[PDB]
């Protein structure tokens, strides 16, 4: 199917979609170097690089 999507079922089983937050995500998987918030045009540019 797709490489990224490998056994999504693993985590998808837990309710469906969670109610995570900026705090929870920052705590669990800290941004390399220094914490920030990637926003606007740069989001789509970052998502495009998958191709």
């Amino acid at each position: 199917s797709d490489l990224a999507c490998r056994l999504l079922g693993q985590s998808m089983d837990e309710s469906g979609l969670p109610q995570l937050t900026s705090y929870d995500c920052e705590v669990n998987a800290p941004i390399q170097g220094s914490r920030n918030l990637l926003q606007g045009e740069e989001l789509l540019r970052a998502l495009d690089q998958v191709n």
Partner: protein, 95 residues
């Protein structure tokens, strides 16, 4: 931190990437729907919101607060091996 929260974050990261991948592919070239995952439309709505919204830390919406964080991580992360960043950067399956 908690391992099951990491599991949840892993799927959010993959789903958010799918939302744009699906959109991109469909617009570029398609006949049969590019989409596979049910939750894709939910992430597409979140994707649209993220670009318009500028509150970030202050945004009360779970999705907005989370989605900015996952993309921030993936963009900055240049680690030897990370449970999401590595397979995304260097796809194991190639043709």
């Amino acid at each position: 931190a908690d391992p099951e929260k990491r599991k949840l974050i892993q799927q959010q990261l993959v789903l958010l990437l799918h939302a744009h991948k699906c959109q991109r592919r469909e617009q570029a070239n398609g006949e049969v729907r590019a989409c596979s995952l049910p939750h894709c439309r939910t992430m597409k709505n979140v994707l649209n919101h993220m670009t318009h919204c500028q509150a970030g830390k202050a945004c009360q919406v779970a999705h907005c607060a989370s989605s900015r964080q996952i993309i921030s991580h993936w963009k900055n992360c240049t680690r030897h091996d990370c449970p999401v960043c590595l397979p995304l950067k260097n796809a194991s399956d190639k043709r």
